[PDB]
Amino acid sequence: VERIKTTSSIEFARLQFTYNHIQRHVNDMLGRVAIAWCELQNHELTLWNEARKLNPNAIASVTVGRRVSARMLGDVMAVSTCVPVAADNVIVQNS
């Protein structure tokens, strides 16, 4: 046998409800976004395979993170870093 004591502010519980409602929504939606983003990445991997078959230099340069020459060795790419050249050290023949 006891006596319970009640607070004088529902606002703790109303904040709890508002925060939980907003959190359910944002967690659900950002989870859907992340899931769809993974699916997009795995889904784009096919296009990336086709492109790397097409122009392996550009795809390898983008994926590795630096200008690199590449060529397919079957189902793998062989990369080799390209030497930068100063802009002023390049001359175009007119014809």
């Binding site: 967690n27 989870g31 983003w37 990445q41 795809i59 994926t63 590795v64 060795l73 079957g74 790419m77």
Partner: protein
Amino acid sequence: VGHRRYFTFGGGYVYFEEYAYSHQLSRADITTVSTFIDLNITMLEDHE
């Protein structure tokens, strides 16, 4: 000449040299580059 090839075979590759079998390779034996773009979406934690 200089015919080096890696072919996907099961869970790994089957490295070939000069049109002759060399050995199988584990999938992780070759450096991996990611075409994926990381979207590190963590979740708003429960707060009481």
